[PDB]
Ligand binder design. Structure first.
Ligand SMILES: CS[C@@]1(C(=O)Nc2ccc3[nH]nc(-c4ccc(OC(C)C)nc4)c3c2)CCN(CC(=O)N2CC=C(c3ccc(-c4ncn(C)n4)cc3)CC2)C1
Length: 326
């Protein structure tokens, strides 16, 4: 059932996921059907997607063009979110094409330009990965899926060793497994570093097969953390775990990526820094020599200002979508 008229017609299936289903429709646009009201978690992800995307306006962030839902809270069971139609995503593109360096450079620039705007609003995306980067034939790139987004909260980032996490395994920073809830901007930079590595070789750089295996993959390439980085680890159990490991040397980036541009690998190194406090921030990344041909702070805008039971969340979703009613 895809009930979006009178405005949208001639539907065609694009894809499907845990969120629901997305189609293309003539206003052509993309339309996704969300049916989240039976569970608090799904309502939280829906309200985050909507509240954040309605408050953002940026060329490298997917917008929300329209939202269709019933005229009353009682009748509202589904929500249809209308967005600009794109042609593919970076996950699909990487299955069929090896990207030239100059495409990687331009795509990375756009990811970081959009991320600058997100981080300037004090928001964290928290699930950056190739499938959340939409592309078209003109090589425009848009960041999508803010369902796991949060307002940054560095003062409350601390958690225990081996604390469960929801965002996509392969793109998780090492500190998620050691001491962090993913409430600081550095979590997104790590994910971008993973995406860069993936564009350079068409394979995920750290394909952990399960939770702790993800840290095995990271330490297998970065090598053992330094004493100073262990001094920043916070948790007794994380310190003891890292101290218990045999010494592992760093695998050189030029051995993993022998055909990559040296400036791309220097930036990769800085995004894939073990210690989040030493990891490059988005504005620094934009200013890195690899991206020098595109860097222009005057054309990298920032946000105008920074940023419960399932029944209360439904009321909030109802209120947040009210502006699209005739
Ligand atoms: C990246 S997928 C996404 C999206 O925005 N996709 C999108 C948006 C605009 C688009 N324009 N164009 C495309 C497109 C076009 C062609 C194409 O490829 C062709 C080759 C077919 N790929 C993409 C496109 C695709 C669809 C969903 N979006 C998030 C989104 O809508 N959110 C709201 C609700 C969320 C959610 C998550 C999970 C659950 C749930 N329920 C049960 N379970 C177990 N889990 C419930 C609710 C999460 C946040 C993200």
């Amino acid at each position: 059932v895809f009930d979006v008229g009178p405005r949208y017609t001639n539907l065609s299936y694009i894809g499907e996921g845990a969120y629901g289903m997305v189609c293309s429709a003539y206003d052509r646009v993309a339309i996704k059907k969300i049916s989240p009201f039976e569970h608090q978690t799904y309502c939280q992800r829906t309200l985050r997607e909507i509240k954040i995307l309605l408050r953002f306006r940026h060329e490298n962030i997917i917008g929300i063009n329209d939202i269709i839902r019933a005229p009353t809270i009682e009748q509202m069971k589904d929500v249809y979110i209308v967005q600009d139609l794109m042609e593919t995503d970076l996950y699909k593109l990487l299955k069929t094409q090896h990207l030239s360096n100059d495409h990687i450079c331009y795509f990375l620039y756009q990811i970081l330009r959009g991320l600058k705007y997100i981080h300037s609003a004090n928001v964290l995306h928290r699930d950056l990965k190739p499938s959340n980067l939409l592309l078209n034939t003109t090589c425009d790139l848009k960041i999508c899926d803010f369902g796991l987004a949060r307002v940054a909260d560095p003062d409350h980032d601390h958690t225990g060793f081996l604390t469960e996490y929801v965002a996509t395994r392969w793109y998780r920073a090492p500190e998620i497994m050691l001491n962090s809830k993913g409430y600081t901007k550095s979590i997104d930079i790590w994910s971008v570093g993973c995406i860069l590595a993936e564009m350079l070789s068409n394979r995920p750089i750290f394909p952990g097969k399960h939770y702790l295996d993800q840290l095995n993959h990271i330490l297998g390439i970065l090598g053992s953390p330094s004493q100073e980085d262990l001094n920043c680890i916070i948790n007794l159990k994380a310190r003891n775990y890292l101290l218990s490991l045999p010494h592992k040397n760093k695998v050189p980036w030029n051995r993993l990526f022998p055909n990559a541009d040296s400036k791309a690998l220097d930036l990769l190194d800085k995004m894939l820094t073990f210690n989040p406090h030493k990891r490059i921030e988005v504005e620094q990344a934009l200013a890195h020599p690899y991206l020098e041909q595109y860097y222009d702070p005057s054309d990298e805008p920032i946000a105008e200002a920074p940023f419960l039971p399932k029944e209360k969340l439904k009321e909030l979703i109802f209120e947040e979508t009210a502006r699209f009613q005739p």
